[PDB]
């Protein structure tokens, strides 16, 4: 029985801490580009999704670590897609929060591996995908990415 | 195993004829507003979809019928959503094509019924929904709506 | 957010009347065989589904009309599958109910068409499928099939 | 466009190593009971699934560790369901293959946490779920569980 007008997708996560503010890009039809920043953790994180064959700029999550290395991951959409996302969660001492944040991220597509970005220190996590696609990102962000999760769909 | 970067949704239809030119809005997360025109058939058909909580203007399919009455169904999204779409398919003599078109359309939500619009002549068709949502429209259009179909999702 | 332990599928329908008693086979991974009976309407309707590569007999819905012609539709699973199901709904006078029942049914796969079975009288209905599969049947049955619906999945 | 008669579900994993023999229970409508054994790792792993309101015993994966302690996790289906599965993957001294096996497993439902079972040594992994359900298990087994994966559905 349908009780709401908003469609849904499987959602896994979040991995990371309770700090920062929650955000959810929602779901689309695929991923075209990922723009992030990294240093001793992951700072900025924004995505260019595919929306029915055309690019759609997702909401930005710039964080607040201007010193970080900026990176643009341009996927050969639609032939290239993520088959795994992994990383590390843990406290970043200098933040003085005592809460876990995303210290590192690695993106593996059917074509190549991007990363590891940030610092691989803390507790690892990984989401290998055998069938289906990540069609959206969600998480929490403050000065850095506190947590991350994914929307999945066939 | 995943072999493409484009996600998908269930698709039903089309109902109608082979005339006009094919179009497919793709899929989104919901429906906010439906714009259409009608007279002896359904002429224009355009939708304002929901895309993760924000409106997204779907591609237009105005057809070309100056005399048709225009209707703007503004749903109380997300509390109100379609639970059924029905109508009639059949030849419209004046088009001189001999091909079926969408003569009528009725939209029923969990709150009320909109229509019938057009003329209920020809062969009826209906898509009652018990679980899930219409998240996108597709079809064919010329001077009027030749055919219509739907993308469905939970 | 997940609030129940039972998974779900999109469900379309029901087409037919409010008579009889409700039944729902639930969802599986495909359809292998359909056994029905027909005359001036569709009486019995029972399915053998596929469950992860192996046959699984669903609950029976024989109705209570013993005089109909019995038919067995054995699909070449998994290469052959339904791409459309259509039929007619309408009153059957000898039932003395004045409520619609399933008068006729037609099953079209990517290989061939089965039917029409029963009597093509009343109001037609059709469910053409472009993407996705019927993975379960539901409906209402009394003396004959009063209504029918489908569980859909990618 | 549909090109096969078998439906599908999202599949995540595998977590663990390449040893043992691959197995896949397929997908169902939920989980009713989990039977496993553990010692210096996870040995046996068998599940009783829900299939449209009726239990369905999945194929067994007994492994081969007579000394392992057996555990039966009977969920209060459908009110109780897994919201997270986590564990550890790592080498076993007695295997001398340098390849990982599932050393530990922890099952968290919306009602309680079962485990940890086995030994929490090696590299941790976790699959927290925010929306959707695990409707099937897959993996690899020899004397113990080498790897594990999940079928997911809304």
Domain boundaries, chain B: 1-154
* Spatial CA neighbour of D45 closest among D21, D63, D64, D67: D63
Q: How far is CA C140 from the centre of its chain?
A: 10
As a whole number of angstroms, the distance between CA B135 and CA A29 comes to 12
CB contact under 8 A, C1 and D130: yes
C114 touches C38 (CB < 8 A): no
- Is the previous residue joined to C68 through a cis bond, with omega within 30 degrees of 0? no
CB contact under 8 A, C8 and B153: no
As a whole number of angstroms, the distance between CA B77 and CA B81 comes to 7
Q: Going by C-beta distance under 8 Å and a sequence separation of 6 or more, which residues neighbour residue A2?
A: B81, B83, B110, B129, B130, B131, B132, B133
Q: Going by C-beta distance under 8 Å and a sequence separation of 6 or more, which residues neighbour residue A141?
A: A20, A21, A23, A45, A61, A63
Q: Which of B12, B15, B153 sits opposite C129 (nearest CB)?
A: B12
CB contact under 8 A, D130 and A12: yes
Beta-strand pair C10-16/B123-131: antiparallel
Phi, psi (deg, nearest 5) at residue B22: -65, 145
- Which CATH entry fits the domain spanning B1-154: 1.10.150.120, 1.10.10.10, 2.100.10.30, 3.30.70.1070? 2.100.10.30
Beta bridge partner(s), residue B106? B86
C61: helix, strand or coil = coil
* Spatial CA neighbour of C52 closest among D63, D136, D14: D136
Burial of B72 (0-12, 13-18, 19+ CB in 10 A): exposed
The structure's method of determination equals: X-ray
Look up residue A49 and give its two tokens.
Answer: 């999704």
| A33 shares contact with chain D (CB less than 8 Å) | no
Question: Of D1, D7, D10, D13, which to mutate for an interface test with A (greatest number of A Cβ within 10 Å)?
Answer: D10
Look up residue A73 and give its two tokens.
Answer: 């991951």
Output DSSP code: residue D58. P
B95: helix, strand or coil = helix
As a whole number of angstroms, the distance between CA A152 and CA B9 comes to 12
| A53 shares contact with chain B (CB less than 8 Å) | yes
Locate tokens 């493409």: which residue?
B4
As a whole number of angstroms, the distance between CA A123 and CA D88 comes to 11
- CA dihedral over C90, C94, C99, C102, signed as positive or negative: negative
C126 touches B8 (CB < 8 A): no
| D152 shares contact with chain A (CB less than 8 Å) | yes
Cα–Cα distances (Å) from C119 to C46, C66, C84, C89, C104, in that order, read 19, 17, 18, 10, 5
Beta bridge partner(s), residue D153? D133
Task: For the beta carbon of residue D86, count every other beta carbon within 10 angstroms.
Answer: 20
Q: Going by C-beta distance under 8 Å and a sequence separation of 6 or more, which residues neighbour residue C43?
A: C36, C37, C62, C63, C65, C68, C143, C144, C145
Burial of B135 (0-12, 13-18, 19+ CB in 10 A): buried
* Spatial CA neighbour of C13 closest among C154, C132, C146: C146
Output DSSP code: residue C66. T
Task: For the beta carbon of residue A113, count every other beta carbon within 10 angstroms.
Answer: 12
Look up residue D124 and give its two tokens.
Answer: 């941790």
Task: For the beta carbon of residue B107, count every other beta carbon within 10 angstroms.
Answer: 23
For C151, nearest residue in chain B (alpha carbons): B131
As a whole number of angstroms, the distance between CA C35 and CA B22 comes to 37
Task: For the beta carbon of residue B131, count every other beta carbon within 10 angstroms.
Answer: 17
Residue B123 gets the label, from left (phi > 0), alpha (psi -120 to 50) or beta, of beta
D86 touches D69 (CB < 8 A): no
CB contact under 8 A, D154 and A127: no
CA R_g for chain B = 15
Chains that touch A (3 or more CB pairs under 8 A): B, D
Beta bridge partner(s), residue B88? B104, B124
As a whole number of angstroms, the distance between CA C142 and CA A21 comes to 56
Q: Going by C-beta distance under 8 Å and a sequence separation of 6 or more, which residues neighbour residue C92?
A: C40, C41, C101, C103, C144
Any alpha helices (H) in A30-135, and if so which ranges?
Answer: none
Output DSSP code: residue C51. E
As a whole number of angstroms, the distance between CA D55 and CA A29 comes to 35
The H helix count followed by the E strand count for chain A is 0, 12
Torsion of CA D60, D65, D67, D70, to 10 degrees: -20
Residues 70-99 of C with CB under 8 A from D: 75, 77-81, 83
H or E, element range at D145: strand D145-153
- Measure in Å the smallest separation between the Cα of B135 and chain C Cα atoms: 12
Residue B73 gets the label, from left (phi > 0), alpha (psi -120 to 50) or beta, of beta
| B10 shares contact with chain C (CB less than 8 Å) | yes
* Spatial CA neighbour of D112 closest among D69, D133, D135, D81: D81
CB contact under 8 A, D11 and A126: no
CB contact under 8 A, C26 and D51: yes
| B54 shares contact with chain C (CB less than 8 Å) | no
Q: Going by C-beta distance under 8 Å and a sequence separation of 6 or more, which residues neighbour residue D105?
A: D36, D38, D42, D85, D86, D87, D115, D116, D117, D118, D145, D148
CB contact under 8 A, B31 and A133: no
Beta-strand pair A30-38/D145-153: unpaired
H or E, element range at A54: strand A54-57
- Measure in Å the smallest separation between the Cα of A92 and chain B Cα atoms: 32
Output DSSP code: residue A60. P
Q: Going by C-beta distance under 8 Å and a sequence separation of 6 or more, which residues neighbour residue A135?
A: A9, A27, A28, A29, A30, A31, A49, A151, A152, A153, B7
As a whole number of angstroms, the distance between CA B149 and CA B89 comes to 12
The experimental resolution of this structure, in angstroms, equals 1.8
| D129 shares contact with chain A (CB less than 8 Å) | yes
Task: For the beta carbon of residue C151, count every other beta carbon within 10 angstroms.
Answer: 26
As a whole number of angstroms, the distance between CA A86 and CA A104 comes to 8
Instruction: Give the start-end residues of each E strand in D39-94.
Output: 42-51, 54-57, 69-74, 82-90
Residues of A in contact with D85 (CB under 8 A): none
As a whole number of angstroms, the distance between CA D32 and CA D75 comes to 5
A153: helix, strand or coil = strand
Cα–Cα distances (Å) from A93 to A98, A100, A101, D61, in that order, read 7, 10, 10, 44
As a whole number of angstroms, the distance between CA C61 and CA C139 comes to 10
* Spatial CA neighbour of B69 closest among B36, B100, B98, B116: B36
| A62 shares contact with chain D (CB less than 8 Å) | no
Residue B98 gets the label, from left (phi > 0), alpha (psi -120 to 50) or beta, of left
As a whole number of angstroms, the distance between CA C100 and CA D118 comes to 60
CA-based max dimension of chain D: 51
Question: Of B3, B128, B129, B138, which to mutate for an interface test with C (greatest number of C Cβ within 10 Å)?
Answer: B128
For D139, nearest residue in chain A (alpha carbons): A130
Burial of C69 (0-12, 13-18, 19+ CB in 10 A): exposed
Q: Sheet harboring A30-38: ordered strands across?
A: A54-57, A42-51, A30-38, A69-74
CB contact under 8 A, D12 and A124: no
As a whole number of angstroms, the distance between CA D31 and CA D133 comes to 9
| C152 shares contact with chain B (CB less than 8 Å) | yes
Chains that touch B (3 or more CB pairs under 8 A): A, C
Task: For the beta carbon of residue D64, count every other beta carbon within 10 angstroms.
Answer: 11
As a whole number of angstroms, the distance between CA C31 and CA C50 comes to 5
* Spatial CA neighbour of A115 closest among A144, A89, A85: A85
B141: helix, strand or coil = strand
């Amino acid at each position: 029985t349908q009780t709401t007008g908003t469609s849904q997708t499987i959602e896994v996560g979040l991995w990371g801490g309770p700090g920062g503010n929650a955000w959810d890009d929602g779901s689309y039809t695929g991923i075209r580009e990922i723009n992030l920043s990294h240093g001793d953790a992951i700072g900025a994180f924004s995505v260019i999704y595919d929306l029915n064959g055309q690019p759609f700029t997702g909401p930005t999550h710039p964080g607040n670590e201007p010193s970080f290395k900026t990176v643009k991951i341009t996927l050969d959409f639609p032939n290239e897609f993520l088959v795994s996302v992994s990383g590390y969660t843990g406290v970043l001492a200098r933040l003085a929060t005592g809460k876990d944040v995303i210290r590192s991220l690695t993106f593996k597509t059917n074509k190549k591996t991007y990363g590891p970005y940030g610092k691989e220190e803390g507790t690892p996590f990984s989401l290998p995908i055998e069938n289906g696609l990540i069609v959206g990102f969600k998480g929490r962000s403050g000065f850095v990415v506190d947590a991350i999760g994914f929307h999945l769909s066939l």
